[PDB]
Amino acid sequence: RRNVLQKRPVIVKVLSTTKPFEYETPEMEKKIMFHATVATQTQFFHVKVLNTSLKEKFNGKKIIIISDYLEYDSLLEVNEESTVSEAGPNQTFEVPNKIINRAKETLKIDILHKQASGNIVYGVFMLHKKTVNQKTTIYEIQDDRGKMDVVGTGQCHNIPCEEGDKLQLFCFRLRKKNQMSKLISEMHSFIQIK
Template structure:
């Protein structure tokens, strides 16, 4: 509680459009299993420790996330169903992500029921169902399990109800609005009015006769697809599953000591990262976050994800993590920002030990300065050049991109972009 009080909070409002489906996710006081002809509108509640297995189909899963930043504790949320009811699940063993695949049938045992959730703590609690096992989940039950409650219905729920759903962040009241309060790690998620917001495990509370949804320790929140790479700071040992989107060739960044590295871009389903890899034999793990990059120094912790693991990277996210910023937008960035992108070279000027290039797009022009090993790269006006890890600097009121020790530069053909499709665990 002391840590919570010290962290900042952010308040916003969510609303709904009138065309949203009317399914309600109200909390039930009944734990009885309903008959097929009486499908529930709310998740079933289970209390206490249960050892006997139940077979369920996975309907929806979040990405694993760190809910305790001090101890590095991680978890993910899921929604599962039998043919007659559905459950919300908290999974505190993230290695089980390769079991929780949508549409897959699994067996859950040795679980705990608490506050309307099934809680799973060990890898031994989940197993694959028989290969011939079938399960028919009706469309009605799927809609109710994955649906969003009406805000007007939330006002009639009891305090302490946990809510899942997707809402529009707005200050305009269409059919209803409610305040959402987040604190701690969730305040770093970029979300603005007009965005669509996914909330999982938010608690319904009241304050001064006003109802609100409030984040708790195990809450998960996801906003719009980010336009910028996610930034991580410090040393991280916990594994993160990502898809490799883009990789440079290994290059020697220190000619004296013959030190080599390569750059990469990787992504889970909701964000993307820029990566520096200093061990060119195996890529990724036991990494450090520095200056907006993940830095990897050893070959100790990288492994391929489960062969059956799937990951859906949206086209929007692919475009943003592989995209090139507009030059006009670079002028509004803070000094010291590191830039990746592909640009057309329009001018070249060699002075002393430096080469000065001018790059241009349909929004403007900017100078690029390279030195050292980068001056050996043959690049002429009219070429398209790929720049990775170039620093935005300024000189005499003129902003420019400047190569640093670990910059990468490559002259490429138009549209020559390689997108590896490997999953790695780091």
């Protein structure tokens, strides 16, 4: 149910948030969002927060209840139609450290080269080389097992960084270049220099 608001509340610890950033809609309009990573006692979720008025609810000082969110791309979208509120005195919990650690893992690039087209990728990767073009930036990212291209457009075009900088990627689309994988920026994608 791609476009159906999920009523089933999800009750989560906020593990991390990004700064707010500007993103370009398909029609080239500018909107504001931030990314979040949240966890239950048994799983973690990446969360697109398109309603930046919620930033303080995601400050990670409190367990929160999210309802009327969208579910797709294995992630949660919290938008202007969503509700977020602090969990009650009886609804609080701690997240097992195994989940917190799993949430922050990055796949090796040889694994990404064998991954199916259409998957979503979040991860921290070292920059080998950057080429800025008219509307695209090719960020060549590398680990000890491989190298792959990151195609940045819109808010992901022409981000300042140097060889050896760690790029934190949010919500990239894996696509195939003749059996090699590439990571393609989409409307809600983000690059943070780490």
